[PDB]
Amino acid sequence: GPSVFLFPPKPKDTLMISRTPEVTCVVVDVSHEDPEVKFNWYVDGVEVHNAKTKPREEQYNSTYRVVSVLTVLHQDWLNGKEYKCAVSNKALPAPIEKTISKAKGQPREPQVYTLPPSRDELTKNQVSLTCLVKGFYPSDIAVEWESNGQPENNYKTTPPVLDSDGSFFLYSKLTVDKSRWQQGNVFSCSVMHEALHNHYTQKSLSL
């Protein structure tokens, strides 16, 4: 029978008013015998109908994949409203419902600390700049690097890790040519999180 997957908006979308956060209800494994699928959307149990269903797309394994997108208000998501996607299909014993919401719990402000490279790493051609983000809740967060206004692309960020006190932490590693760090260039770690002022903070790092 069919399967349903419900995806939340990206952390960055809910935190910046310029962007459009969306919850996405994906239905896979819809057979040819019964291709009609209907979506009912609910916000805290109140049915809404402003969703946008996309017309079914046959996949290469002879099954139809139907996607429905519901735009959400930034403050609705941040205020913790529940979003329920009810999927009905005549080849189902009963409709399938999935619910998604922001993690429950008191939000906490990320602490952002930039750490320079260990002196051991200076014998390398490239050095690792570290951004420690700890003590934040919920785990939805975005981390970026930049220098002199332009983005740095050669960086990787760990997934959020549950800390011992119930908050989350992560590390972000920016890799630059050792020549740039030695010159004295300034690098900045950008963090977006709901518990930040303007949902944004910036911590710089230089020799």
Ligand X SMILES: *[C@@H]1O[C@H](CO)[C@@H](O[C@@H]2O[C@H](CO)[C@@H](O[C@@H]3O[C@H](CO[C@H]4O[C@H](CO)[C@@H](O)[C@H](O)[C@@H]4O[C@@H]4O[C@H](CO)[C@@H](O)[C@H](O)[C@H]4NC(C)=O)[C@@H](O)[C@H](O[C@H]4O[C@H](CO)[C@@H](O)[C@H](O)[C@@H]4O)[C@@H]3O)[C@H](O)[C@H]2NC(C)=O)[C@H](O)[C@H]1NC(C)=O
Ligand Y SMILES: *[C@@H]1O[C@H](CO[C@@H]2O[C@@H](C)[C@@H](O)[C@@H](O)[C@@H]2O)[C@@H](O[C@@H]2O[C@H](CO)[C@@H](O[C@@H]3O[C@H](CO[C@H]4O[C@H](CO)[C@@H](O)[C@H](O)[C@@H]4O[C@@H]4O[C@H](CO)[C@@H](O)[C@H](O)[C@H]4NC(C)=O)[C@@H](O)[C@H](O[C@H]4O[C@H](CO)[C@@H](O)[C@H](O)[C@@H]4O)[C@@H]3O)[C@H](O)[C@H]2NC(C)=O)[C@H](O)[C@H]1NC(C)=O
The contact set with a copy of itself (CB under 8 A) reads: 111, 113-118, 120-121, 128, 130, 132, 134, 154, 156-159, 161-164, 169-171, 173, 175
Closest contact distance (angstroms) between CB of 23 and ligand Y is 9
Give the pair of three-digit tokens for residue 99: 């619910």
**Both structure tokens of 65:** 């994949």
Beta carbon nearer to ligand Y, 71 or 183: 71
65 binds, among ligand Y, a copy of itself, ligand X, none (CB under 5 to 8 A by kind): ligand Y
* Residue 44 binds which entry of ligand Y, ligand X, a copy of itself, none, CB below 5-8 Å type-dependent: none
Exactly one of 12, 65, 98, 173 binds ligand Y (CB under 6 A); which one? 65
Nearest approach, Cβ of 56 to ligand Y (angstroms)? Answer: 12
For residue 4, the minimal CB distance to ligand Y (Å) is 9
**Closest C-alpha among 115, 129, 111 to residue 193:** 111
32: burial class by Cβ within 10 Å (0-12, 13-18, 19+)? exposed
- Choosing from 29, 76, 97, 109, the residue that interacts with ligand Y (CB under 6 A) is 29
Q: How far apart are CA 147 and CA 189, in angstroms?
A: 9
Discontinuities in the chain with C to N beyond 2.5 Å fall right after none
* Residue reference for tokens 């998501």: 77
By beta-carbon proximity to a copy of itself, the closer residue of 24 and 130 is 130
**Cβ partners under 8 Å of residue 112, min gap 6:** 131, 132, 133, 189, 191, 201, 203
**Under the criterion CB under 6 A, does residue 26 sit at the interface with ligand X?**
yes
Q: Find which of ligand Y, ligand X, a copy of itself, none residue 177 binds, CB within 5 to 8 Å per kind.
A: none
Dmax (CA) of the chain: 67
Residue numbers of the site for ligand Y (CB under 6 A)? Answer: 3, 5, 7, 24, 26, 28-29, 59-61, 63, 65, 67
